[PDB]
Every structure is written in structure tokens, then in C-alpha cells.
Amino acid sequence: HMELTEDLNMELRVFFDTNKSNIKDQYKPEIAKVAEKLSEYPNATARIEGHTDNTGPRKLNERLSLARANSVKSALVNEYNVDASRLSTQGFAWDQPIADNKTKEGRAMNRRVFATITGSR
Amino acid sequence: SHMELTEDLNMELRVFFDTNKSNIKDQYKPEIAKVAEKLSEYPNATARIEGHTDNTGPRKLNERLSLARANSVKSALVNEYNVDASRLSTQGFAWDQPIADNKTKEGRAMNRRVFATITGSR
Ligand SMILES: N[C@H](CCC[C@H](N)C(=O)O)C(=O)O
Ligand SMILES: N[C@H](CCC[C@H](N)C(=O)O)C(=O)O
């Protein structure tokens, strides 16, 4: 006898322009690959978390962070027919920076969605 | 790039043997083939193959036979499936690691085994 499992772990990082929550063209191949693996691992789920740099009104950044996570989700749901209930979204506004908000470069890093996908088969 | 993707494989194989024998019996061949299939789909995976005996008969016979059983499973992957030999370790433990009661025929049959763990990622 023989038993086997395969475990999926994926991290997707999507970055955004100031004030924007669109998915730039360059990320579309990475979203396609996430969709492919959610089909290959049908029990898989994703936790999609969106973020802003620390500029502009708090209320703007609460919305924009969630809008960025939702744009990612929407791309999977609408363009790849991924079931919505497998993908959670949350926005964290500026509360979890990964880089220096003092520089243009650190702010571009903070304007992001990180999605973690896990599954097994 | 903007994505990290890992798929981890964990697979367990159990093969059991007739007394004094290290040949692979036919009923085990579909499983060994499925192991070779995954070692191909995960070309970085390796296998730890461990052979064992029941506690009957001379000590050195069991030392040799336990490693012979582990080597016979390795030999099937290497020779029939062209798995790279350096990816597979073999080790015999004679009767030192029983999984069943050596006082019965059925327990002795469970101890005459090779257990292999195959792990890796792609
Ligand atoms: N011009 C805008 C930039 C804010 C949006 C920013 N926090 C982002 O993450 O894209 C302002 O400073 O009010
Ligand atoms: N009839 C042999 C059997 C010994 C090998 C046995 N320990 C095995 O694991 O196959 C003897 O008693 O010397």
C-alpha cells in the first residue's frame, strides 16, 4: 500500500499605483497561475489582504486597501470563474507597512495586495 | 517575480516480503510504479527506504536480508523506472524495529517489510 498527499502553498504579491486599485497588465499571468492552482487543488482557499502607503485620509486608505484586495478577488471570480466563497478579502489601510513610507520606493512597496493560497490533495 | 508557489509531496510506501526473500512480489508493483511516477513529477524529491525482518533466524542473516529488501525496492526504481540512484537512500534494521508481534505468523509477516518515505517539493 501507498498513501500520498500534495500540499499547495502560494504567495501572490500585486502592487498598485497611487490611488489605484486596478490590476496592472503585468500581474495577469500570476493571477492566471493562481486560478490554475485553485483548479488543481479544488479544496484550496485564499486569504487576500490589501494595503496602502500611509498618505492621504484614513477613510480613503481603509476603502482603497479593501478595494485592492477585492480587485484581486474580482479578477479570479469574474475572469477565471473561481468560486467567491473560497477567497477572503480584508484591507489593512496603512497599518501593516513592509517598507519605509518616507521614500517613493518604500511607498510603492506598501501599495500592495498579498494573497496566500493553501490547499491539499 | 511577484509569486512564490510550492507544492510539497509526502508519500509513504509499504512493501512486504516472504520469509527469507527480498524479491518484490507482484501485488507491490503497481505501488512502486506510482512512486516512480511521483519521483518523476517531483524531480527534486528523494526517498528514504528502510528494510526489516522478523526476529527469526541468525542475526547476520537478518542484517543482510533487511538491507537486501531495502535495496530490492531501490533496484526496482533505479532499473525499471530509471530513477536516479543517488536520490534514494537504503538502510536495513534487521529485527530491531518491529511493527507487530513476532510470536505469530501474521505479525512476523508484517515485520518482513520495507517502508519508504518519499518527500520533496516542486
Ligand atoms: N494623492 C493621494 C495618495 C493617497 C493614496 C495612497 N495612500 C495609496 O496607497 O495609493 C493622497 O495623498 O491623498
Ligand atoms: N527460516 C529462516 C527465516 C529467517 C529470515 C526471517 N527473519 C525473515 O525476515 O524473512 C530462519 O529461520 O533462519
Curated annotation (Swiss-Prot), chain A:
Meso-2,6-diaminopimelate binds at residues 19, 53, 55, 61, 68. It is found in: Cell outer membrane; Host mitochondrion. Residues 3-121 form the OmpA-like domain. Disruption phenotype: Significant loss of the bacterial outer membrane, not as able to induce apoptosis as wild-type bacteria in human cell lines. The periplasmic domain (residues 221-339) binds peptidoglycan (PGN) and diaminopimelate, one of the components of PGN. Homotrimer. Forms a pore with a size of 1.3 nm. Live A.baumannii and purified Omp38 elicit identical effects with respect to the induction of apoptosis in human cell lines. Functions as a porin. Induces apoptosis in human cell lines through caspase-dependent and AIF-dependent pathways. Purified Omp38 enters host cell and localizes to the mitochondria, which presumably leads to a release of proapoptotic molecules such as cytochrome c and AIF (apoptosis-inducing factor). Binds peptidoglycan, contributes to cell wall maintenance. Belongs to the outer membrane OOP (TC 1.B.6) superfamily. This is Outer membrane protein Omp38. It comes from Acinetobacter baumannii (strain ATCC 19606 / DSM 30007 / JCM 6841 / CCUG 19606 / CIP 70.34 / NBRC 109757 / NCIMB 12457 / NCTC 12156 / 81). The gene is omp38.
From Swiss-Prot, chain B:
Keywords: Apoptosis, Cell outer membrane, Host mitochondrion, Ion transport, Membrane, Porin, Signal, Transmembrane, Transmembrane beta strand, Transport, Virulence. The keyword Ubl conjugation does not apply. Disruption phenotype: Significant loss of the bacterial outer membrane, not as able to induce apoptosis as wild-type bacteria in human cell lines. Its main location: membrane. Residues 4-122 form the OmpA-like domain. It is found in: Cell outer membrane; Host mitochondrion. GO terms for cellular component: cell outer membrane; host cell mitochondrion; pore complex. Meso-2,6-diaminopimelate binds at residues 20, 54, 56, 62, 69. GO terms for biological process: monoatomic ion transport. GO terms for molecular function: porin activity. The periplasmic domain (residues 221-339) binds peptidoglycan (PGN) and diaminopimelate, one of the components of PGN. Live A.baumannii and purified Omp38 elicit identical effects with respect to the induction of apoptosis in human cell lines. Functions as a porin. Induces apoptosis in human cell lines through caspase-dependent and AIF-dependent pathways. Purified Omp38 enters host cell and localizes to the mitochondria, which presumably leads to a release of proapoptotic molecules such as cytochrome c and AIF (apoptosis-inducing factor). Binds peptidoglycan, contributes to cell wall maintenance. Homotrimer. Forms a pore with a size of 1.3 nm. Belongs to the outer membrane OOP (TC 1.B.6) superfamily. This is Outer membrane protein Omp38. It comes from Acinetobacter baumannii (strain ATCC 19606 / DSM 30007 / JCM 6841 / CCUG 19606 / CIP 70.34 / NBRC 109757 / NCIMB 12457 / NCTC 12156 / 81).
